[PDB]
Amino acid sequence: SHMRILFLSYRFNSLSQRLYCELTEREHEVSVELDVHPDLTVEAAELYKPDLIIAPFLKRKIPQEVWKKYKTLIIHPGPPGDRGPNALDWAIMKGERIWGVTLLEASEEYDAGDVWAYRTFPMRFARKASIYRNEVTEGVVECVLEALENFERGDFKPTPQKEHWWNPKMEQELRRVDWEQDDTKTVLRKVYASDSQPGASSKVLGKEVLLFNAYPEEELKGKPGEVLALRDEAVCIGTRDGAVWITHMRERKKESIKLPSARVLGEFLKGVKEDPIKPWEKVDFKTYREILYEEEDGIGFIHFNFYNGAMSTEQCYRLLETIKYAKKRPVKAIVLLGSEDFFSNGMNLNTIENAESPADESWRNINAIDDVCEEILKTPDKLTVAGMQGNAGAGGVFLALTCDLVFAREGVVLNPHYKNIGNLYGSEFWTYTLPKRVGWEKGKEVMENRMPISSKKAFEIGLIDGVFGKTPKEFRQRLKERIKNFINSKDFYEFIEKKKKERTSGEWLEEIQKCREHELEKMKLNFYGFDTSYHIARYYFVRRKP
Template sequence: MRILFLCYRFNSLSQRLYCELTERGHEVSVELDVHPELTIEAAELYKPDLIIAPFLKRKIPPEVWKKYPTLIVHPGPPGDRGPHAIDWAILNNVKEWGVILLEASEEYDAGDIWAFRTFPIRFARKSSLYRNEITEGAVECVLEAIESLERGKISKTPQGEKYNWNKIEKERRRINWEEDSTEDVLRKIYASDSQPGATATLQGEEYYLYNAYPEEELKGKPGEIIAIRDEAICIGTGDGAIWITHLREKRKDSIKLPAVRVLKNIKAPEIPLKPWEKVDFKTYREIVYEEEKGVAYIYFNFYNGAMSTEQCYRLLETIRYAKKRPVKAIVLMGQEDFFSNGMNLNTIENAESPPDESWRNINAIDDVCEEILKTPDKLTVAGMQGNAGAGGVFMALNCDFVFAREGVVLNPHYKNIGNLYGSEFWTYILPRRVGWEMGKEVMENRMPISSRKAKEIGLIDDVFGKTPKEFRKLLKGKLEKFINSREYYEFIERKKRERTSPKWEEEIRKAREHELEKMKLNFYGFDTSYHIARYYFVHRKPHFRTPPYLAKHRRKIKL
């Protein structure tokens, strides 16, 4: 089928649906929601069999949905309408939620339902629920609807007149430190993450708060900053305390940053906690190190998968610690929502010199990758529970084995941020995995691929597990079996011979030097594409057109 996506942004859900449909043989083109007239034009240019709107912020013009079958993904169960569906569910402590696929209509979210799924709702960030339960349910709904269309047997259910309109007023997101319990504070932040953020007063000023963790040991006055750890702040509540990793100032051009980079003159003490230190209470840990049956697992909870220079240093320290331990394997696990997305563009944008900070950041990530590569006596593994992009994909590929969960979406390219050349030893690892021809295709393609497709082309080694929990369980079983087999010892012997040879050392050195020479031009050269693209990305500037790599219908035909 010819399918047109209408999106406000080509976000994680849109990318997942794109992968699922194109890899099933459907032709998909994407139009970003720039202007209603351009939406109408896109439909007329492409003449789709079906239009799907995975993520929109305004109504679709009637000139489109009256002419073409048009289905909208709404992140709520039947009877739910409005712009703040998941926010409303979290704030009201709803036990079950869902996702529906409905027809576009004159009234907002009022069209007939083609398919729906429900699920028990976790007490978690809105963005996490969206990337996991909502996304999985949306995929099932869309595939069900397409199958119905192809069979010519469409079953629709009217919405009915009784519904819940779920718009959340700003005051509902505001934190009152004196009156709100720790759970109340967490709920407001979870419901507002990643947009628009919960609001609160800190040190006499108003801020947006993001990414919260409960704290069971530390106590303090409500609203008082009582501790710092890994650039996060711990704040007292009415009955305990919470950690906040990111803040944003309440001004139009502000961006999300680690909390200590936003607040000034914090007088609270630094209370460090190493990833391998054992604690028996809930607290914030950016990196968690665990050993189990001869395997070291490193979980890194970097917000939105972005890795600042300082976070890279902390991850590097943890990997070096693991290399000294009596373990047979070291596994990089990332987190459930993201494995890694490479450089932290927000901290770079905020730096006094973005080119200098870009250079520091890419070198720090390369240090992590080189440390992984130079591990001759242990197995290294990437366990991709969540999505990955750009340098995050290639950091994973530096490991001996790369495993990913079903449904994970990968963007193994750098071009979408100002045509970056890329580093992380991709010129060394990519040809070894897929060959130069396929490697070139991977780097030139600016569209996402699924973990299933990545395995098919040889980019990663295996795909398994429907949920992060199932993936972790299967991964641990697979590793336990392998490290206790003869194959493991044979593998390590071969690896030692390769990774301790001067020829290999020279190859690695040249790969890094070549890539960084190209990246230096991206950061400091006359072409400012990277800096412009980074600015637009960080400040969430709306698109003024749909780029041709997304919109097949807008590509010029070359004769």
């Protein structure tokens, strides 16, 4: 009932972090060992002497020395019998209607071990990373729990594979987007199967690129392969039967990084003109809406779909513009929803890494996100709510915390700390926000913890205000119901009374200004001072090896 569990992962990735939260918070010890070398793996296992080894995320054989001596269970993102290193990629390229996940034993043949548990699910037409983070992750969690229960019994015998098949590593030629030959559906299937790695190769404006994060376009039309418009740095490209938006691209070179399309395409883009759509406009056709504002039951909902939850300096100002709009509206509550897969991961480290001066662009980014946080804070006459449908890390968590109420879906993983990015001091009014919820001592413990915590755990420690919902859709409905109830009550007006008296106080208003200028002073030293931890850690996060 207190098992010692060793994780063998290539990287401590989203699924590995979620499993670590699920097991740790059920009182098991989990040691995490990143795949460096087979000799080092046998070493780490021999010291730790686990009762059970889980491989949430592997790129290569586990040494037979380890799994013939410790029970080793492998995660595989395919249904029983599916073998190979790109299971999801193939499932999407082939158009599988039904898919699944398999927890199988380690064996001498790749993925040929007996099955300990599996789940199946219906497949959405969506990015590989979104399938992985939702259906695959929730399914994996169920298999691992059912496997830990069967391990306790010891009277469990796994099921050998029957029908099986092999899919090899998928080559670039198969993902290559050809605009004259590929319809919109085919472009989306190729980009979906390659998002977020390795990307679909293509040529745009005569430049060889990798495509990322596609969206169908039903109004704009033109010459296939012709760039039709810009819109918040995304480009819309003619296909064989219509058009598609591509928000992010990467030059096909060693040192190049994923960036918004306009930054990759650059001066190659001069003829093209913007085609704006404000978030509050209503639209009858499918197009790409980075930020979306809709009103339901006297409630203002701000969706913001920032790729990978990274918030560029410019995306912060686009968001602030929408919060200012929402604040002049006949609405009683304003709810920041983020996206389904991410609430926010703070500053965009890719646009920072790309800038002429990363220190300068860091200065811009932190002041832009602080401007968003200050605007939320300065809402005396409305209720402010953060709805975390997906994961959040670093500054993105503390953005959420400036809202009056913070809710999250079950299974959301949070990293409210800067231990991965050179120990930035942090801003986003955390010195005002965090103590008001957990106290200066526990808040420091939280920011000192480099391991993840669940949405469940954050509820306990008072970090957030409630956790519910299994899916993003479910969580959204629940959140709308709960907020509609509250503003349709007398409590809402008694809540606002206090908020109005305190928030328009010159005491409070200058208290938060001291906090901002305090955090920004610390962050300025991180950005510009002798210790360069931040820039070293950014370089490796942004350019990590796949």
